[PDB]
Structures are given as structure tokens and as C-alpha cells.
CSV table of C-alpha atoms and ligand atoms in Angstrom, one decimal:
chain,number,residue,atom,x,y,z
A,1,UNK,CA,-21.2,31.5,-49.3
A,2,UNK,CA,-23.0,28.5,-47.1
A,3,UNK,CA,-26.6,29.3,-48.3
A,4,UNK,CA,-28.7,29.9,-51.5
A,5,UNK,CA,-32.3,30.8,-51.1
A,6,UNK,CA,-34.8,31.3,-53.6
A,7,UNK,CA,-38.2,32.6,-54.2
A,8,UNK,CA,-40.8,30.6,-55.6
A,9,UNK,CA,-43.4,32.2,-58.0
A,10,UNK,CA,-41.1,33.5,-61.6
A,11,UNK,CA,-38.0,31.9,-60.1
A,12,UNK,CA,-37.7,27.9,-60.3
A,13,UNK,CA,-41.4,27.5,-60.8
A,14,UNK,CA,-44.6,29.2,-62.8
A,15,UNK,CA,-48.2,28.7,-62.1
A,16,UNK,CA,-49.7,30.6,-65.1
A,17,UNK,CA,-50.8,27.6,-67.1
A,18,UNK,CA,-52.9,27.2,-63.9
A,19,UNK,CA,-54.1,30.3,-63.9
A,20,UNK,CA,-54.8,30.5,-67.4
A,21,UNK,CA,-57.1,27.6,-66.5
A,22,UNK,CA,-58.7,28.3,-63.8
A,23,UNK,CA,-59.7,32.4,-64.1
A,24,UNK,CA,-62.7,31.2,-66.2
A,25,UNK,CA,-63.8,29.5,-63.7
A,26,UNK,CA,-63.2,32.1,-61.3
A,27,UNK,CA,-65.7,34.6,-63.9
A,28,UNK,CA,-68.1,32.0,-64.3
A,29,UNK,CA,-69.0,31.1,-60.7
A,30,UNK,CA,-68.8,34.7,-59.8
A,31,UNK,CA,-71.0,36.0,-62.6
A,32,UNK,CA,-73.5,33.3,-61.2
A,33,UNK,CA,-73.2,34.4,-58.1
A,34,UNK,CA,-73.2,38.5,-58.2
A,35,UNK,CA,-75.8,38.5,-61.3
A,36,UNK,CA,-73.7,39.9,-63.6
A,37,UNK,CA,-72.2,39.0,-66.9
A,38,UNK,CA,-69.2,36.8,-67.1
A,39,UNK,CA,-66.8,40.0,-68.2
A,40,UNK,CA,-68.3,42.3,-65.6
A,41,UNK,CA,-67.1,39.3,-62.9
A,42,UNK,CA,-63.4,39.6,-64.6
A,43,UNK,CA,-63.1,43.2,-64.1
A,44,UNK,CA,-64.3,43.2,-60.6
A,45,UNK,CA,-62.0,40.6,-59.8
A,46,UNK,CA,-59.1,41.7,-61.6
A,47,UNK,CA,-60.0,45.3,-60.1
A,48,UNK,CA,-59.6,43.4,-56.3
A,49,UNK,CA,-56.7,42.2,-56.8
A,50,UNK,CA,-54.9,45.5,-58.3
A,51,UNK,CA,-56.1,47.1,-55.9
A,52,UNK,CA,-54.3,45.0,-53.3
A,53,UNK,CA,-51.1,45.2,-54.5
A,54,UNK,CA,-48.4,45.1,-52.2
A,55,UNK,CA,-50.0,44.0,-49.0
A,56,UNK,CA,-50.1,40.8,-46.8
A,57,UNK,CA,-53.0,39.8,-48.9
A,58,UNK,CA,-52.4,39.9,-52.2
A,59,UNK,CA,-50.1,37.0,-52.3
A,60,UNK,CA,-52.6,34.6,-51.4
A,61,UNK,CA,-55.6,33.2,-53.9
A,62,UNK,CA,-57.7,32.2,-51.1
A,63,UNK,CA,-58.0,35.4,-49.8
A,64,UNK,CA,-59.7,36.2,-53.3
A,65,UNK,CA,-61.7,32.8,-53.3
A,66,UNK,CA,-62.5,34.2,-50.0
A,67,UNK,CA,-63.1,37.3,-50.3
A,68,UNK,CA,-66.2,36.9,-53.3
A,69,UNK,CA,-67.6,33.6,-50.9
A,70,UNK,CA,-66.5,31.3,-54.3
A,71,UNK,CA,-66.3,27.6,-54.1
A,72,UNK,CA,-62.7,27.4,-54.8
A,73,UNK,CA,-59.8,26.4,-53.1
A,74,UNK,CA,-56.4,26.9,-54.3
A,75,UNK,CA,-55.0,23.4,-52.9
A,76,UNK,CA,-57.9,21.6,-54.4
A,77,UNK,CA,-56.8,23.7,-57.5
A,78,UNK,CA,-53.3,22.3,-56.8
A,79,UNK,CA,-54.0,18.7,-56.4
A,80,UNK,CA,-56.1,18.2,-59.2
A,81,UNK,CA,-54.2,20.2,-62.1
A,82,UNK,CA,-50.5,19.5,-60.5
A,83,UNK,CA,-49.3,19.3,-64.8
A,84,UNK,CA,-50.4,23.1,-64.9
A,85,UNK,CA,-47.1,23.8,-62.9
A,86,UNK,CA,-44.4,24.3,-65.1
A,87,UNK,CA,-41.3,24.0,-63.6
A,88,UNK,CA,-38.3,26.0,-65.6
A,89,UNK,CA,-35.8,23.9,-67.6
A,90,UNK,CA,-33.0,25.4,-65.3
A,91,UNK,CA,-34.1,24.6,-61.8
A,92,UNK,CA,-33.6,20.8,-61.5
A,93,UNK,CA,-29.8,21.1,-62.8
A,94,UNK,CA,-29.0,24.1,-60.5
A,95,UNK,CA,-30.7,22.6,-57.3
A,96,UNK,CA,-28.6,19.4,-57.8
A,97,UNK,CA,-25.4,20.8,-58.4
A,98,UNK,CA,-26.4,23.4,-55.8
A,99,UNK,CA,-26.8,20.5,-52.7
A,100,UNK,CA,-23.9,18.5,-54.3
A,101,UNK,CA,-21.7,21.0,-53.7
A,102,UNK,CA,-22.8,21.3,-50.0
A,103,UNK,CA,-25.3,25.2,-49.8
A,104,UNK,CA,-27.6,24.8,-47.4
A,105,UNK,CA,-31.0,25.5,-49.6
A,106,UNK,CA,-33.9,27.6,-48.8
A,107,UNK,CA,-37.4,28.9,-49.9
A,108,UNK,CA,-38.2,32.4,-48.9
A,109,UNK,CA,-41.7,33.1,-50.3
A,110,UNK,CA,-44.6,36.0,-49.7
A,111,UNK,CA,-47.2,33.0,-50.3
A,112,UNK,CA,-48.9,31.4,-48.3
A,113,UNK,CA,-48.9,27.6,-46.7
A,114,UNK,CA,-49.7,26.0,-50.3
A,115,UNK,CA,-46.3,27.3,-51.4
A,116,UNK,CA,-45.1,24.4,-49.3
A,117,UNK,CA,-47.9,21.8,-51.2
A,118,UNK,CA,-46.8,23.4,-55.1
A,119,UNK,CA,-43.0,22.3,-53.9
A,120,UNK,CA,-44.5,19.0,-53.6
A,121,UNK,CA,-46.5,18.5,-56.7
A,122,UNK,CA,-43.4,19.8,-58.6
A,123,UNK,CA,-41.1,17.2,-57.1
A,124,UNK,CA,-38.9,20.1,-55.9
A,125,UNK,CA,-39.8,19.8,-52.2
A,126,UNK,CA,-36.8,17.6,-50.9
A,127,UNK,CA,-34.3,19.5,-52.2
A,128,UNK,CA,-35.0,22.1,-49.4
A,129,UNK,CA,-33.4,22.2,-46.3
A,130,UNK,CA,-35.7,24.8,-44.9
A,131,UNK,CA,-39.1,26.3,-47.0
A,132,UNK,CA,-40.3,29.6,-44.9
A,133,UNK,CA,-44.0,31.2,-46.4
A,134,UNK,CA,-45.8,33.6,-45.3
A,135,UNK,CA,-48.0,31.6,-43.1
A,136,UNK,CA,-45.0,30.4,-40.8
A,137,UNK,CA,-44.0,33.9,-40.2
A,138,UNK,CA,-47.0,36.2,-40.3
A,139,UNK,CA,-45.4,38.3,-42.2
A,140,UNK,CA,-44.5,38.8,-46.3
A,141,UNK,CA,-41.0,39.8,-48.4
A,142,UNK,CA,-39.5,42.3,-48.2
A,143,UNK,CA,-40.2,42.3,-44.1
A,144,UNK,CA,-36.6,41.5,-42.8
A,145,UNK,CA,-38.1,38.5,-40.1
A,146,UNK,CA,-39.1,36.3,-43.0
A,147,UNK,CA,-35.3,36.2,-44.5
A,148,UNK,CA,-33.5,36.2,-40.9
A,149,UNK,CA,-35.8,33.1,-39.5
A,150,UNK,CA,-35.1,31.2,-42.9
A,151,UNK,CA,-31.4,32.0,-42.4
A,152,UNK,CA,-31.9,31.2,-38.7
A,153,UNK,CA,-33.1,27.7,-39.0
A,154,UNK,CA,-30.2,27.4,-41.8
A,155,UNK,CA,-27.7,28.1,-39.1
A,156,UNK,CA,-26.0,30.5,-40.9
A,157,UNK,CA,-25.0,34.6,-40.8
A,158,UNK,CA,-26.9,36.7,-43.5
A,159,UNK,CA,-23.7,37.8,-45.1
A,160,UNK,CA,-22.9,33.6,-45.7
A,161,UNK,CA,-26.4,33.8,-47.8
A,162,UNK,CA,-27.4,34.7,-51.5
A,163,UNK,CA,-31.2,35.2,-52.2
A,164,UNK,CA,-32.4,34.5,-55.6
A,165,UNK,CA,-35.8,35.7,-56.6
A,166,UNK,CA,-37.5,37.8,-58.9
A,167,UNK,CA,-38.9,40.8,-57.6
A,168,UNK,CA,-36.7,43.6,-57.1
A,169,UNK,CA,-39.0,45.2,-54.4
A,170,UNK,CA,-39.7,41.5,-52.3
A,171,UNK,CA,-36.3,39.8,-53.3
A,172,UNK,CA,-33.7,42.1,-54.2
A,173,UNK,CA,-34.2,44.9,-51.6
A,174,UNK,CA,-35.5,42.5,-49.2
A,175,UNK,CA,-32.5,40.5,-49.1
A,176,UNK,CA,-29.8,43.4,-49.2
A,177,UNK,CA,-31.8,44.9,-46.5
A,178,UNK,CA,-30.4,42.3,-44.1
A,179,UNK,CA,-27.2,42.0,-45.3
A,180,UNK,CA,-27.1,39.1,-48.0
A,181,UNK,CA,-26.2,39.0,-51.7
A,182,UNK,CA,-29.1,39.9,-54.0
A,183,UNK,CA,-29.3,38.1,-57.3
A,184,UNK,CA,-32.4,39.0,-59.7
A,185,UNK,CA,-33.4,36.5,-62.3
A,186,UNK,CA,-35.2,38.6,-65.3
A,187,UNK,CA,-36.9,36.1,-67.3
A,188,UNK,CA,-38.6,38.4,-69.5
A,189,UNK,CA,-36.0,41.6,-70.6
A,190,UNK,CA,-37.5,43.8,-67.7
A,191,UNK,CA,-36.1,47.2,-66.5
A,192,UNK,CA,-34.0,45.9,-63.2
A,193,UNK,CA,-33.5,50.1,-62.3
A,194,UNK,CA,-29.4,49.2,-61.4
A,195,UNK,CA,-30.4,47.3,-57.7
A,196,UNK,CA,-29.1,44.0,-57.7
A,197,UNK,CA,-25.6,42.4,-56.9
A,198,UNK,CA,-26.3,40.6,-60.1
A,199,UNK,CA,-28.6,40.0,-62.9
A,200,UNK,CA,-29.1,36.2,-64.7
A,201,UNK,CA,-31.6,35.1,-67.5
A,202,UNK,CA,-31.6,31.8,-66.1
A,203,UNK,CA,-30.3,30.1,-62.7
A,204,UNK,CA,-27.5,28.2,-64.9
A,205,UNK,CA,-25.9,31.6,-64.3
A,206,UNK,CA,-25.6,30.8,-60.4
A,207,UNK,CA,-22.2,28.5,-61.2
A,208,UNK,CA,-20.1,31.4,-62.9
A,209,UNK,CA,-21.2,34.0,-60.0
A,210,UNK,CA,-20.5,31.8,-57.0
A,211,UNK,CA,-17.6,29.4,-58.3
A,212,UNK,CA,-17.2,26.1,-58.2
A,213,UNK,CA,-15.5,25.9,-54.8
A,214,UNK,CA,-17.3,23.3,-52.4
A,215,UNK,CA,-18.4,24.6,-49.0
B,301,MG,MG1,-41.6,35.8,-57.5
């Protein structure tokens, strides 16, 4: 292998304590908006959002903002609540030892442009050779153009690349789909239907599949 790319969202990063903050806000400035109550605002929001679900624009939380005229903007979300970005214990120690050992490193994410600012906040940005969202390609996981233009500006052949996410439908079959290894992390003891090349818990798990072996 000359490559490891991961996903961002579930993978070395969370936003839920964000989001956790934030959807009250979201119900409030809705309900004061639409004229209803603050719960009626949280089902019609939740209910736009399901009902998105796997297309270009669910992956963005502007295009909700957007899409109910709120006064919010994710990056300004971003900025001022940076600490509500938790970034997994096992990240940091993998990325190092990762670039030490000479991987090229990507991001391959269905998210828009403020993927690239979240990176940034988290202090996880210059350990990236190349970051690749859905905003640079037009296009979201598991389309094959977003992996091969990552592994493109990598300089590297799909089969010399591993993709680490965790979404079997964006990550797993996305990645196999144009020829690289498929790894799922599964986090949370969820059903991973017998897809991927292999299955970790945590990234820590990355050193025993790929060896020690420098590139
Ligand atoms: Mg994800």
C-alpha cells in the first residue's frame, strides 16, 4: 500500500456534541419563524432531512439552514463552538505513525467545503496530503470521481490505496468499487452485512492489517 484515505464524519472526528448544541437553536428560530411550536419545528426539520437521505444534499447543513431561510451558518457554527468537535482518542496516534511511515494521506468526504475548515479547528488539517469534499468535485461518496481524483492528485493507482470510513454504502462500496481496499470502522456494534475487506473498532487496528513495513 502507498495511500490511506479516510472519511471524515464517524471516522477520526464527531460533530454530535455540536449538534446536540445547536438543534435547539435550529427549533427555536424556526418555530419563530413558521408560527408553530418549538416541537412542531423539530419534526418538520427532522422530517427534511429523512427525507433526503442519500442525495447530494443531505450531507450539507446549509442546505437545511437554507432550505427553512434560518439565520445560521454552519462555519459560523464552526468557528465559534470549535470544543464541540470531538476528535477520537485513536486518530492523532494513527495519523502520526501513518505519515512516519511514509502513506500518502487523504480525506475523501460527501460534505461539503467546511469539511476542509472542521480539519482545521480540530488541528488535523496538516496531516493531509490531499482533502477532496464534495464541493471540489460536484459530486458525493459512493460516485467513483470523488475517490479516483483524491487518488489522482495522490499520484498513486487505486489498488496502492486503502479507504477507511464508516459507511458501508459511501465508504466501503465506494472504495471497492474502484478497485481499493475497503476497511469499515464500526464504532458502535452495528450489523456490517459481510462487505468489507476488514472490520476495526478503532483505527489502532490499521498497524496489524497493513504491517509495519515502511513504503
Ligand atoms: Mg462517515
Amino acid at each position: 500500500m502507498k495511500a490511506v484515505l479516510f472519511d471524515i464524519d464517524g471516522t477520526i472526528l464527531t460533530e454530535e456534541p455540536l449538534i446536540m448544541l445547536f438543534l435547539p437553536q435550529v427549533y427555536d428560530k424556526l418555530s419563530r419563524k413558521l408560527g408553530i411550536s418549538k416541537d412542531e419545528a423539530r419534526e418538520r426539520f427532522l422530517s427534511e432531512i429523512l427525507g433526503r437521505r442519500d442525495s447530494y444534499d443531505w450531507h450539507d447543513w446549509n442546505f437545511f439552514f437554507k432550505l427553512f431561510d434560518l439565520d445560521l451558518k454552519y462555519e459560523e457554527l464552526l468557528e465559534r463552538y470549535p470544543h464541540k468537535l470531538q476528535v477520537y482518542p485513536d486518530t492523532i496516534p494513527t495519523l502520526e505513525w501513518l505519515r512516519d511511515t511514509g502513506y500518502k494521506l487523504g480525506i475523501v468526504t460527501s460534505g461539503p467545503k467546511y469539511q476542509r475548515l472542521k480539519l482545521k479547528l480540530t488541528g488535523l488539517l496538516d496531516y493531509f496530503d490531499v482533502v477532496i469534499t464534495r464541493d471540489d468535485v460536484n459530486a458525493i461518496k459512493p460516485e467513483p470521481k470523488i475517490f479516483l481524483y483524491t487518488i489522482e492528485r495522490l499520484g498513486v493507482e487505486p489498488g496502492e490505496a486503502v479507504m477507511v470510513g464508516d459507511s458501508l454504502s459511501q465508504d466501503v462500496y465506494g472504495a471497492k468499487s474502484v478497485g481499493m481496499t475497503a476497511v469499515w470502522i464500526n464504532r458502535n456494534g452495528d450489523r456490517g452485512y459481510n462487505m468489507a475487506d476488514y472490520e476495526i473498532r478503532t483505527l489502532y487496528e490499521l498497524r496489524k492489517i497493513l504491517g509495519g513495513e515502511r513504503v
